[PDB]
Design a protein around this nucleic acid. Structure first.
Lengths: 115, 155, 73
RNA sequence: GUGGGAGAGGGUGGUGGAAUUCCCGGAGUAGCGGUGAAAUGCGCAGAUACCGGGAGGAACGCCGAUGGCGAAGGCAGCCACCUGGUCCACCCGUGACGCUGAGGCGCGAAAGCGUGGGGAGCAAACCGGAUUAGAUACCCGGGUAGUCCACGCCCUAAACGAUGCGCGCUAGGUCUCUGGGUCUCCUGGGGGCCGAAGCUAACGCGUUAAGCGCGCCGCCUGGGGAGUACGGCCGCAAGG
């Protein structure tokens, strides 16, 4: 118990694994859940189900801190970005607003072989 | 089937009860087209239900079927050079088909000697939610949401 | 379709070179901080070419953004 | 000559924000990352995801086009300075002063060479991981030269429109950048597509000619052997 109502929920999606981190209003993470932490270990994490789980068990750990309100922040394009959000929208948390602030360079580091 | 959906064969109701669901069931018992025998099996198998159960076998039959129709199944699919099991919602046609077929495939596995009996008993333990006709049901669905990790393809 | 309403049609006489007029420019930026394409601005080959340079200026004087975040998704 | 215009044309100095890596702090756990799968690797000296702070190099989203500029190679964040080309209008001034152009001189992508600086990302070679009958590969994780900067050299190329420069002449339609006009239309320069006559082995070309013609340079003359051999010239070398 630490009683921290209303916080932020960063959702970091990939083409290899989706994760979630729940931070406090200030920006400090309270509890974070990935995909490889649930049980799955490889090709499995990219799945929308993998993300679903990752999202849900990540809220269950927040309800423990009395988390009620949350602003959702999505990072990137993964496989099941959606399902992660739709997850929190049913986990029992009040969803303020969904934010998309995926990091696009304005042409900087020369990307590697696979663009 | 390549050009059309192919019309489904309409059957003749039963001479006794009159439910076509009956006709379907027997057909499934019938081997080597001995439909005169297959009929007796069902009948005497109903008589066993009256003597051992205080209910009308017609209704009993139905509740049994009703209870085995699995509502979820798997369908193999080569997605990216691999066998991914893809759960999917089952149609009314297939349900009916699967039920009867399992009611009989399980039935004949019973440790009982007489065939009319073996069927009679499967129709009872069925309704009560047990036996093996219903086990081959829960075993299927136990694969449905088992790999519901993959429900994101076709349909 | 993109046949919503161009920003030139719903606007008045305004100087393309006054890079300080934020109240207007903002009309030329997307829901993000990006520069609207000609299909959306309603402008011409020459106009857009200028409006381009002008925004990159007001950006510099911390007036107009370089990129926003999104409200839905 | 005078008055307009457009442009990623070049040079120098400067400066803006995104992202990346690294460093520090905060908070926080058990994984992260990567693949068709996987492993190599990174994490309890606490990684990942998240916030804040700092350093540094590279590059410059959107606008951006089937667009513009340039002799070509090639050129795009913003600003200022220095500078080349060019187009239009007026028809003012010179009075044929013009075209071409062996050798020459200059420019010349990428890689590569010297000395010095710099090094974030990427990445020959090289080190491991997996794949396979095998893999000195295609895939994954690292990684040195190099790639960025200066001065100097190298000078090649599918350096391509694979189409030398310059002038005149020969239906149009349409889209587009740009200038003048009496501007629902005329008129100049440029970029595209379709297409008359004509040409073409055909494909195609077609007022951006591969058409009808004149000038001048360059080059070809069976394939392989060879862009080799010899010789000379060049270069630090690689080589040309």
């Amino acid at each position: 118990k630490r009683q921290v109502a209303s916080g932020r929920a960063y959702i970091h999606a990939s083409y290899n694994n989706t994760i979630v981190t729940i931070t406090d209003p200030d920006g400090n993470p309270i509890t974070w859940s990935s995909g490889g932490v649930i049980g799955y270990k490889g090709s499995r994490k990219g799945t929308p189900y993998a993300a679903q789980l990752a999202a849900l068990d990540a809220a269950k750990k927040a309800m423990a801190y009395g988390m009620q309100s949350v602003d959702v922040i999505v990072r990137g394009t993964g496989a099941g970005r959606e399902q992660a959000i739709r997850a929190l929208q049913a986990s029992g948390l009040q969803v303020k607003s969904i934010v998309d602030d995926t990091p696009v360079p304005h042409n900087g580091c020369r990307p590697k072989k696979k663009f | 089937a390549r050009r059309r959906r192919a019309e489904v064969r309409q059957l003749q109701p039963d001479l006794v009860y009159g439910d076509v669901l009956v006709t379907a069931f027997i057909n499934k018992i019938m081997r080597d087209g001995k439909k005169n025998l297959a009929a007796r099996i069902f009948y005497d198998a109903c008589k066993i239900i009256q003597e051992k159960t205080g209910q009308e076998p017609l209704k009993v039959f139905k509740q049994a079927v009703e209870n085995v129709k699995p509502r979820m199944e798997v369908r193999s699919r080569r997605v990216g050079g691999a066998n991914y099991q893809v759960p999917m919602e089952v149609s009314p046609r297939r349900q009916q088909s699967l039920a009867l077929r399992w009611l009989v495939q399980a039935a004949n596995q019973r440790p009982e000697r007489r065939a009319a009996v073996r069927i009679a008993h499967e129709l009872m333990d069925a309704a009560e939610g047990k036996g093996g006709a219903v086990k081959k049901k829960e075993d299927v669905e136990r694969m449905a949401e088992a790999n519901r990790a993959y429900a994101h393809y076709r349909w | 379709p993109s046949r919503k309403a161009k920003v030139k049609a719903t606007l008045g006489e305004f100087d393309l070179r006054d890079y300080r007029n934020v109240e207007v420019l903002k009309r030329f930026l997307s829901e993000t901080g990006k520069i609207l394409p000609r299909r959306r601005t309603g402008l011409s080959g020459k106009e857009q070419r200028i409006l381009a340079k002008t925004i990159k200026r007001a950006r510099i004087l911390g007036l107009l953004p370089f990129t926003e975040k999104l409200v839905r998704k």
